[PDB]
Amino acid sequence: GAVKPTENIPSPILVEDKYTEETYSRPDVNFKEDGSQGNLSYTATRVCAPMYNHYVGDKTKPKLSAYITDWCQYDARLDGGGSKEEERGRGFDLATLMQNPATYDRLIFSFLGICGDIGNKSKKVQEVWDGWNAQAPSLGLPQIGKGHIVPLDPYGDLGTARNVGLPPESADTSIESGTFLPYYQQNRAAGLLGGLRELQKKAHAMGHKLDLAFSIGGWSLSSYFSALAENPDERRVFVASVVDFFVRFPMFSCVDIDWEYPGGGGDEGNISSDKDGENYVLLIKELRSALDSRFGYSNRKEISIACSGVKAKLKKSNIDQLVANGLDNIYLMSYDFFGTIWADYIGHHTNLYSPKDPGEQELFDLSAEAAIDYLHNELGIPMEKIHLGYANYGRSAVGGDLTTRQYTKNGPALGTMENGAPEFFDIVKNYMDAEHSLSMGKNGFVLMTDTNADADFLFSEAKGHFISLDTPRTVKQKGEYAAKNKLGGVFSWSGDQDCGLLANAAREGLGYVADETIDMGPLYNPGKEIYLKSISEIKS
Numbered sequence: 001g002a003v004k005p006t007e008n009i010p011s012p013i014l015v016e017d018k019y020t021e022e023t024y025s026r027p028d029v030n031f032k033e034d035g036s037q038g039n040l041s042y043t044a045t046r047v048c049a050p051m052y053n054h055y056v057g058d059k060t061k062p063k064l065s066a067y068i069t070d071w072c073q074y075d076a077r078l079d080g081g082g083s084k085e086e087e088r089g090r091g092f093d094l095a096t097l098m099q100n101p102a103t104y105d106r107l108i109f110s111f112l113g114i115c116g117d118i119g120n121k122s123k124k125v126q127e128v129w130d131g132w133n134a135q136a137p138s139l140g141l142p143q144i145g146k147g148h149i150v151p152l153d154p155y156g157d158l159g160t161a162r163n164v165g166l167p168p169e170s171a172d173t174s175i176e177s178g179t180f181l182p183y184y185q186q187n188r189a190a191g192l193l194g195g196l197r198e199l200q201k202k203a204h205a206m207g208h209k210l211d212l213a214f215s216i217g218g219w220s221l222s223s224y225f226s227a228l229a230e231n232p233d234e235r236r237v238f239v240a241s242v243v244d245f246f247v248r249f250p251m252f253s254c255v256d257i258d259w260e261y262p263g264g265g266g267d268e269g270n271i272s273s274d275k276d277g278e279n280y281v282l283l284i285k286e287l288r289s290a291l292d293s294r295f296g297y298s299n300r301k302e303i304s305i306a307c308s309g310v311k312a313k314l315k316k317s318n319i320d321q322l323v324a325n326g327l328d329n330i331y332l333m334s335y336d337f338f339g340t341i342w343a344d345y346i347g348h349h350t351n352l353y354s355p356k357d358p359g360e361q362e363l364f365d366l367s368a369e370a371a372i373d374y375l376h377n378e379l380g381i382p383m384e385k386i387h388l389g390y391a392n393y394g395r396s397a398v399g400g401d402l403t404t405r406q407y408t409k410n411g412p413a414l415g416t417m418e419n420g421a422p423e424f425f426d427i428v429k430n431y432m433d434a435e436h437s438l439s440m441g442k443n444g445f446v447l448m449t450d451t452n453a454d455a456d457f458l459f460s461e462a463k464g465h466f467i468s469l470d471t472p473r474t475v476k477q478k479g480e481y482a483a484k485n486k487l488g489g490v491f492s493w494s495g496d497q498d499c500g501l502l503a504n505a506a507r508e509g510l511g512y513v514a515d516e517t518i519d520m521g522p523l524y525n526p527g528k529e530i531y532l533k534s535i536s537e538i539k540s
Contacts, residue, residue, distance in 0.1 A: 288326025479509020
């Protein structure tokens with residue numbers, strides 16, 4: 001039967017947020033929900049209610065992991081701000097997960113930085129490094145130097161209470177770069193580290209094991225990995241500071257090294273070298289050794305690394321040798337395959353399947369399965385070590401043409417906080433209706449399904465806005481692929497940008513069954529079917 005949306009909203013997702021709405025109207029914003037005016041919405045996450053369903057545990061199914069960043073808690077609009085860009089924040093409230101504490105099997109605190117960093121957050125890394133070294137004599141602790149991991153935001157990590165699930169009296173505004181060291185341990189922390197401690201306890205109290213991991217690096221904090229990995233003295237400082245973090249915060253059981261990426265192809269200011277892959281093997285070997293001598297094999301710590309979803313990049317990371325030398329998990333960052341400014345053609349940014357005649361798959365027509373197949377078939381990596389990412393955000397383009405796949409590379413593309421990046425809670429608010437028992441576009445957008453790659457996107461014809469995103473259908477599809485192929489799991493990039501719909505779709509694709517907040521079943525429909533030709537097909 002052809003499906004029509006319901007007139008009624010059986011399961012409300014959207015919630016009124018005065019601050020978001022006020023921001024749209026500001027003269028430096030002029031955001032109209034059909035994307036016809038200002039291109040940035042600055043929407044807060046408060047626009048969506050928590051939509052998490054509760055699924056029955058099942059030890060035989062792949063895991064669901066999520067990143068949570070330390071800066072998503074902020075939104076200065078809650079304090080009367082918002083005239084400045086930086087005062088409009090996401091405001092993700094961890095209390096939403098305290099109320100649904102079994103939602104994820106693992107949460108990955110992100111991101112720590114490294115002394116030595118020379119990228120855009122170098123001043124902050126330096127501030128904290130200096131701060132640490134100022135405090136250490138009085139605490140009987142030694143000086144730290146290049147290679148040592150550090151928090152980026154001592155207040156957000158250890159001092160806040162709002163949006164981190166803690167009582168207001170736990171907030172401590174005296175915590176800053178020059179004072180945080182005594183509070184840098186599990187029984188003292190407030191901030192997001194305190195909230196994660198508390199979330200993990202709430203999960204345990206209702207029968208759920210929530211693993212906690214911490215990630216070092218990520219896109220903006222990767223500039224110095226190449227140098228520390230080359231220098232055995234600095235490798236030794238890095239490794240010991242990893243061990244030290246686990247000692248400070250024993251609630252963590254895994255460290256994720258998010259070096260993006262060995263051999264280059266990360267941010268262009270990163271140090272890189274053709275020795276990166278071989279030096280990473282040395283770093284993992286030494287880490288695996290240090291962790292296992294310190295904690296042993298029963299109360300064991302795992303090691304995870306970021307892996308590019310581009311074959312040409314991940315080859316530079318010697319991942320077979322990493323596994324041979326003690327690596328536990330490979331987090332496949334199979335997203336950002338398309339983005340405005342840099343890509344020559346509009347495309348899917350996080351598609352699992354390759355289109356017909358996808359070519360070299362270096363700059364376009366990429367897919368998660370191409371990377372997985374290379375990892376498994378050419379490098380012999382067991383599927384169980386690989387975790388498949390899904391994106392809780394789109395990559396958009398303006399001026400898009402679905403026939404030629406050309407677009408306005410330098411145009412103002414829709415986004416929440418940055419050009420071209422509409423985050424999933426903002427997409428649910430403005431461009432995709434999931435509230436009337438069907439997944440469809442709204443405000444002039446049409447939900448489409450590309451039958452070539454089998455991936456979904458939103459398109460609005462007037463200005464040619466194209467938004468590539470993960471939808472409940474494609475996240476369910478990724479979950480199915482992970483369960484069928486016995487991957488280690490799927491993970492959410494980033495958990496704080498979902499309202500629960502994609503976590504639900506992931507659980508259902510992975511084969512978990514509800515023990516509902518929202519009936520996901522009618523939301524898994526394809527959109528308008530179109531055949532987006534691969535670049536090779538267009539060019540021939």
